[PDB]
């Protein structure tokens, strides 16, 4: 059907409050399925998806050992970047990284991703071609210079095109009832008068997957629209709505249009009293 | 100078403590230790990362290790046995591309007792006068006998220059009598050169034999002298007859 | 998993193309292959790095590698083998054992030996005398073709060494030799009961 894989690493420093903290979560499409924390007294790779719990103990000991060495790897990375900017040892700093492979409808990769950050700023990234890098500042070149000679991008090109695609594919089959089956939203339109001349028309979309959805308000001539967007529900589905202030008296003229993957055809809604 | 490993050869008794050291390259951050038997390939002992062990494979807890912040590593091995005699290699990498740059290695030998260790008796042999007529060449034969243990490095020095052309040595030494387990060994090497170069009385030839035996630390209580690590050579000058 | 090098020992002559066979079995998809040369000094030098997504054929100099994923073999080929190429060649595999570690797994080891191409074989048995004022005698069997195999003393007091190996850096002189000696009575004529042949010089 469709596939995507992402890994969200996060390493922050707490001078005086202990050692740096490392947090890692895994994603397939918009469904989180891995969770790891360094501060737990029992730090183990926890799962958040029903289809992965099938994996044996060697899988979970592997994922735990990897993160138990990445917490020492980024702790030195925090000390190294602290030296590049000669930042004070009493300052808190954070490093964030994202990577993963993207599978295509044919079955092979389309775009492999790898990117890091420091204090919320882009630090270093792997290019579209998996071989090179792109530095953001002067200090990024220091780390770039090391990975140029250690063939770090060589490891990623073999991982993103190898184990990542092989396992992102295995996850699609073990959970195809939910990962390859999209659920259209539960849509309805509400209304609440604000004044004698104005009125609020809110269009709801509930319980949909994946997260991508479009909600717009339109008068038969054209389209206008307050849009708080894509909050989660906690049941691995998301909720979203769009509202518009309409003149009370001419209310029926406004229409709501929904564009979603799970819908066979785009919907058009009108507030029916 | 990225790859070093100290010491080179070492002899210890059954049930002691050894500490092999290694120095990493300037750009590397990991150290992986291996153990190679005479027939098998290098088997993987533990790997260290930033002073915390990364992972170990198929070895008892007595095999221990430690990594220093200046990229220096150790291999503290306890309770030695006779089968722990092998070639111990040191590797290095930097968590990037998995490439292991091996070191020179360390030839470790464990014995039950040190009463059989003996240095070699080296003696060279001048070429045959009939060989000068037959092949127009001159073959120098070197022979080191009555030595224990096995590893010895035999180099040929001609005019103060370590020559490699025209040299050949036996792959492994020879047990003097195969009936005895502690039999002494014997190795032989040859050097071939032109006859005119040998018939010159101003050209000299030397057969260096490096022998790896006991060290200063190990104690000796026999009547004869301590068979320490020493170089025993034999020299011969040119002749025209 | 495991790595297997079926070839135990290989005996070739100069300028002859010799190929080395290294096969691997490995279910997980991502791995890094390697080839190491170990001269008699004991250390292993880094030759090649091959990966899972790489090509099928790759040649560099006299070395020609053949990595294919169907046969799951990384068979190595040495073209125009020279005396310096005589060593032990290992192929390793960098897989995931356990976690957070790509460990190496070396195969049995292939012994490659390059014997001199004796174009004009002239076997002979000479006798040598101690240079430094002694009379101990040594017998020498030299200048024989590479196809001759002798190693049996067949006597306790008599000692016999087998065919030697040339130095790797030995550019100039290349010959086969064998040395026998003893300190008892009864001698150079009886020294070689091992494959003593028609064209032998006895001074």
């Amino acid at each position: 059907g469709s596939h995507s894989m992402r890994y969200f690493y996060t390493a922050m420093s707490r001078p005086g409050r202990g050692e740096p903290r490392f947090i890692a979560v895994g994603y397939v499409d918009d469904t989180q399925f891995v969770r790891f924390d360094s501060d737990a007294a029992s730090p183990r790779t926890e799962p958040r998806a029903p289809w992965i719990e099938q994996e044996g103990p060697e899988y979970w000991d592997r994922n735990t050992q990897i993160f138990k060495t990445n917490t020492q790897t980024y702790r030195e990375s925090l000390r190294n970047l602290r030296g590049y900017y000669n930042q004070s040892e009493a300052g808190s700093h954070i490093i964030q990284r994202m990577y993963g492979c993207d599978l295509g409808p044919d079955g092979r990769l389309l775009r492999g991703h790898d990117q890091s950050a420091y204090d919320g700023k882009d630090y270093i990234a792997l290019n579209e071609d998996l071989s090179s890098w792109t530095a953001a500042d002067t200090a990024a070149q220091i780390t770039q210079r090391k990975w140029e000679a250690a063939r770090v991008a060589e490891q990623l090109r073999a991982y993103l095109e190898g184990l990542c695609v092989e396992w992102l594919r295995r996850y699609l089959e073990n959970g195809k009832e939910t990962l390859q089956r999209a659920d259209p939203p539960k849509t309805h339109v509400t209304h609440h008068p604000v004044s004698d001349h104005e009125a609020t028309l809110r269009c709801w979309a509930l319980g949909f997957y994946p997260a991508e959805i479009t909600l717009t308000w339109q008068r038969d001539g054209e389209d206008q629209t307050e849009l708080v967007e894509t909050r989660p529900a906690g049941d691995r589905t998301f909720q979203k709505w769009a509202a518009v202030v309409v003149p009370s008296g001419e209310e029926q003229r406004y229409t709501c249009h929904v564009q979603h993957e799970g819908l066979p055809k785009p919907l058009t809604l009108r507030w029916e009293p | 100078a990225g790859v070093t490993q100290s010491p080179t050869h070492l002899i210890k008794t059954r049930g002691q403590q050894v500490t092999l050291r290694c120095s990493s390259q300037s750009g590397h951050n990991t150290v992986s230790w291996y153990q190679q038997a005479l027939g098998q390939g290098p088997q993987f002992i533990f790997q260290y990362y930033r002073e915390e062990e990364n992972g170990r494979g198929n070895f008892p807890p007595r095999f221990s290790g430690l990594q220093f912040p200046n990229y220096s590593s150790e291999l503290n091995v306890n309770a030695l046995e006779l089968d722990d005699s092998a070639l111990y290699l040191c590797a290095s990498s930097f968590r990037g591309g998995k490439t292991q740059y091996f070191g020179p290695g360390t030839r470790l030998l464990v014995l039950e007792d040190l009463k059989n260790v003996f240095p070699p008796e080296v003696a060279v042999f001048e070429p045959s006068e009939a060989e000068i007529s037959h092949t127009q060449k001159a073959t120098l034969v070197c022979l080191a006998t009555g030595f224990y243990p096995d590893h010895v490095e035999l180099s040929w020095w001609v005019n103060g220059k370590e020559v490699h052309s025209g040299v050949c040595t036996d792959p492994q030494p020879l047990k003097e009598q195969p009936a005895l387990n502690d039999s002494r060994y014997a190795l032989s090497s040859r050097l071939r050169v032109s006859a005119t170069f040998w018939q010159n009385p101003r050209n000299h030839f030397r057969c260096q034999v490096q022998f790896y035996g006991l060290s200063e630390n190990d104690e000796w209580t026999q009547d004869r002298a301590k068979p320490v690590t020493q170089i025993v050579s034999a020299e011969a000058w040119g002749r025209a007859d | 998993q495991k790595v297997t090098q079926a070839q135990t020992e290989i005996s070739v002559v100069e300028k002859e193309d010799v190929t080395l066979d290294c096969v691997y079995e490995t279910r997980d998809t991502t791995y890094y292959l390697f080839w190491y040369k170990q001269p008699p000094s004991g250390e292993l030098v880094f030759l090649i790095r091959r990966n899972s997504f790489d090509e099928q054929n790759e040649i560099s100099g006299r070395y020609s590698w053949n990595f294919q994923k169907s046969t799951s073999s990384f068979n190595f080929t040495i073209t125009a083998s020279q005396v310096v190429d005589s060593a032990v060649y290992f192929c390793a595999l960098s897989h995931n054992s356990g976690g957070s570690n790509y460990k190496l797994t070396f195969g049995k080891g292939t012994l490659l030996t390059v014997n001199p191409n004796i174009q004009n074989p002239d076997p002979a048995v000479y006798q040598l005398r101690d240079s430094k004022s002694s009379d101990k005698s040594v017998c020498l069997f030299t200048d024989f073709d590479s196809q001759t195999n002798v190693s049996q003393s067949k006597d306790s007091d008599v000692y016999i060494t087998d065919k030697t190996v040339l130095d790797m850096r030995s550019m100039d002189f290349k010959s086969n030799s064998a040395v026998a000696w003893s300190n008892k009575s009864d001698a150079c004529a009886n020294a070689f009961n091992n494959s003593i042949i028609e064209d032998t010089f006895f001074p």
Binding site: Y7, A24, G26, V34, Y59, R62, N63, I66, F67, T69, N70, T73, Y74, E76, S77, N80, L81, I95, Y99, S116, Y123, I124, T143, K146, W147, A150, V152, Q155, L156, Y159, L163, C164, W167 | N29, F94, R95, G96, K98 | N96, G99, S100, N101, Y102
Partner: peptide, 9 residues
């Protein structure tokens, strides 16, 4: 599975 070995900064 995540990336087996990580470089440092």
């Amino acid at each position: 599975i995540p990336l087996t070995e990580e470089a440092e900064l």
